[model samples]
Target: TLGNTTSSVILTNYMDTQYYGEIGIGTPPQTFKVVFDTGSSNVWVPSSKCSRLYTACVYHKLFDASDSSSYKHNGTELTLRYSTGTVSGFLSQDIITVGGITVTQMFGEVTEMPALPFMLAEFDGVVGMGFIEQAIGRVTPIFDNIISQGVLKEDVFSFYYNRDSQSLGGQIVLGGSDPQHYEGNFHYINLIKTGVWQIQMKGVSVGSSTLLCEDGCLALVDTGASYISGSTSSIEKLMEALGAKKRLFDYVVKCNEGPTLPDISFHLGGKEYTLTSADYVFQESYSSKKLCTLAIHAMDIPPPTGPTWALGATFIRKFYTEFDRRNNRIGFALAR
Candidate 1:
């Protein structure tokens, strides 16, 4: 029998911006909403010392060392750089409780926040699940701490998501996969890198034309991204294949023509997963006109940098995803 502990996670989605969950920190347990990001490996929250001049800092829950008796000052300052901006903070240790499991771990106490519009998002911070090599501050990640502290019965976790808003949307199982959330058998794949949940993308096909990445390509399963993104050149080719027009940095298509559009599929782990027009096209009302935009966009991570494809929630929401640390593998199955 598998000794696994499952935790109930509350998934919150704000206008399809991003999915986040609320977790507890400190001794008395102060709750803060944070994104469960698989692309990063460090946890951070706004500190009480953060300047009020930054409107984004005051929007979310703040961490105050004086309020928690379990808080310990590590006195190590670091700067975290993202595509949008930077967050400078000092390291601090505190008792973080998740799904009834507790672990005293070191996290960043952000003294300065970024100026990007997303900084004012509903989430206060991020609880990254990536490996230690991806961590910027050289601190152990939450998932790793769970195993080191012997708090988790199993060294695995799973995520289930849905597009429906009226429903529960999704859940994150702490120590095991929920059999009820998935159907059929799971297809497992080996990780190409230890840093992120990086995997190999076998190929990409549109309609019945030609296939891209004939020799395979790099892909990262990142929950932090709002949508799936491809390399600049690849994305441009994809848009052209779909007969989409570029409009104000967005690929526009005819709303009525979406249903008639050909299928786009991604080959991974020798399995072909297809996406329909409804899966890749989003309609938004702008200036009294309903505009259809392609959900996938061009994101240049630069050569010799990382993945060619960032498979965000757009892909994860379509299936049940499992991350196995001990086996160093990722699994996917059809969502039930």
Candidate 2:
């Protein structure tokens, strides 16, 4: 009964900044909130052994091996690097339950967490829903285990993000997509690489001007990233077109001018996926001033993956995304 069942995990949205879901670990099933990230390929949680001095460990839930009767020690140390910071931990194995599917998998028990991102993060850990090629220590990912164990109806997973800051977040569907969350047909694209969900992107445009990837480029359908990202030079050009100015780490624009902003479009898989000004501009009330910030940033990945565009939540909010592991392809349909 490999393709006989489907599971759904309800996710919580933190002011549209991050989306995460609950999962249970160990014998008694200790619960934790985790980001189901398609950008990476490893599972990690704060370890109970982590020093209290680390503010991140103090704020988040910790996984204590002694409390779990099913815990098994692997002890291989690992360090993971991300755009924000690094996390160091050791490996361990235990029963993990996502939605309703349970499986034994090796995961990270983090001893050290960086203050930049983790300290302020809303979630306790990350469950990477990616291919094993990018995994640290080559550990099999949890999603892979779900498939291998025949816990799903199909080797597919989909995401639907509720962009409204005041609404009931979203959901991640394992095994198949929920038609209620999407409309029309899906624009599918084959993966260019196995390490990440890499695909070919034709171009990017803001109104009449094609700002980046005019001759085609690589793109990743990343759920872990909060905003869309591109190379420094290209992002600068894009900002100029959007009438956004550099204000520290963010590009700022007058909140009143949001409606006047043009649409940003990404040409992918021979189809044009567009985002309206409301979808790409983030509005916030800081101090006494209302600020509108462009939801795209500059982050250059080194060669092999360099000059790539990460179509994060900003783009995903408008498109219901499907990751088909069995076919090595990704599908996008307009979200309802």
Candidate 3:
């Protein structure tokens, strides 16, 4: 059923903070926008049983099992926690459509939504693109289902994020990458583990000066995270190098001095992937002036899962990223 066929889903960029694409669930197809999060493995959306008093579910679309002929009850309760908040729900089986490919998969229906993030999120829910090992119920991930159903030509998927707030955003390509969205050859790196898309970082530098990860470190290619994150100590050093000052919980820099800032580069696969000031500094217009914030933050994951940096949308916006499940590797190319 597969012959070099690929499907592309258009993603919408929300304030350069999040990128989401639409998907259909069930026989008749209940549509929802979801984040193709590479940081975790578990698909979930608000359930019809979600109370109206929960403002998080009230503003978002809910999935009703009764409305879909393809829906099958699993009823196993599961709770997921993230840096932002938590969501508790039950498992369900249904046919899910991504791009144009369809497959039967198990997903979560959230009865409890985190009020903090979910209530303010632009998308309806999350579609985890991480490996099945990280899945709460040990269920097959959506991409694995696509492969098992012979819906794609290759066991790979890619993301292209358009950083321009005025543009069409970007796209996610299943089966293969779209050549039109990227340029140059892709530099590939092997995953350090089977769960999340973890890779080894050779080092990070500011212009010519090598900074963190001088002896190598682990990093996750995470789309779910909006900012690049590292340990508090590492972030402090980086912030000092970038001349960024802590304001409340965020690092702020002078908008006027952005052009003078040096480039931050990540050494990966013996190649340097760099981000200019424009790529790492988020700018906004204030009432009387322009404000700029560093798009990198401090996050400590603690040991075992500890000391891993997240190359989030900030890094992905400049590089087209490919998750190659078949090869257990990741590829990066300059975004067009």
Candidate 4:
């Protein structure tokens, strides 16, 4: 045991597609796999109140409010409207446990579902790690409850993901950082926005060509998304530099050309983090046809969703990321 200094849980790769972990909710310990998301706030699980017609909810283990003696309805009907679907539910207070740390926190019990995207996965729901401002109905987040309970040595959280497919994949360390996963000095960036984990991205460069966010851009370190999404204009330039040809929806490149592509670097906090061609270009076989493509893809973000860049797993896998809620800053270090 590391005392109260820290607590961590393994985040298993979901079909080599996403990362999720086990979390126990309600009384009597009903556990479910959930995606710990930094892009949104609030925790939600499928509830028994959902209709049988909802195959998505019925397929997973539902949280029975009646079974939990400690359950309390907050009288607030919570509704989360995402780009994909709308999750309408209600708030309930209960005991939620993660990484051996237990806290009395509010979680959404989803009763109504409308063709949810994450239906067939082994996981059941999502646990948001964003600030209170982004939380639905101003409910206190789980991390806030953890901090208030004084169970941690420091109000810090970090994540490290493995791409080699050899390790347990990754871990989210709460209360302190993992020194074994990172090397070099940590670079700091202030949170320009409080609702989400927003930071100022100085610029992006392909070799000597500085192409993205030239004037400056806001980037959100989103763990919920799978792709490294950038503005359409920015992605077009990146696609050209990577020598990728547009294929239906995805950009494709000759497997041989991947080795010769220049490194792509992102400038942050007056320092640059570079991704070699092997790091940015991923090769895989589709229908027995070998395929190579750039990880950076175009996203048509409206001038306002706070950021033009959503730094997803592609970037997180290369660096040790630290989220310090108490200090309102984000830290990054090269992964060991």
Task: Please provide TM-scores, in order, for all candidate models, with all chains considered together.
Answer: 0.93, 0.96, 0.95, 0.90
How would you order the candidates by lDDT, starting with the best? 2, 3, 4, 1
Q: Roughly what TM-score does model 1 have, to 2 decimal places?
A: 0.93
Error of 4 at 246 (Å): 4.0
For model 3, residues 107-170, the per-residue Cα lDDT tens digits are 9999999779897898998899998888888978888778777768888999998986666798
Model 1 residue 327 CA deviation in Å = 1.4
> Candidate 1, residues 113-150: lDDT per residue as tens digits?
86584355788888988889878867899988888765
Candidate 1 stretches greater than 4 Å from native = 1-4, 247-249, 284-289, 303-307
Distance from true location, Cα of 14 in model 2, Å: 0.5
C-alpha lDDT (0 to 100) for residue 161 of candidate 1: 71
Residues 1-336 of candidate 2 have per-residue lDDT tens digits of 476889999999887779999999999998999999999999999999899999999999999999999999999999988878899999999999998888999999999997788877999999999889889899999988898887688999999988866566889999999999999999899998766798999889998678778888888899998889998888899888888878877787888777778988898886899998889877553332567888888888777666688988898899999999988999999998
So what's the TM-score on candidate 4? 0.90
Question: In model 2, what is the error at residue 280, expressed in angstroms?
Answer: 0.9
Ranking by TM-score: 2, 3, 1, 4
In angstroms, give how far residue 260 of model 1 lies from its true place.
2.6
What are the candidates' C-alpha RMSDs?
Answer: 2.3, 1.7, 1.8, 2.8
- Collision pairs in model 3: none
- In model 2, residue pairs whose N, Cα or C atoms come closer than 3 Å (at least 3 residues apart or on different chains), thus clashing, are 3-153
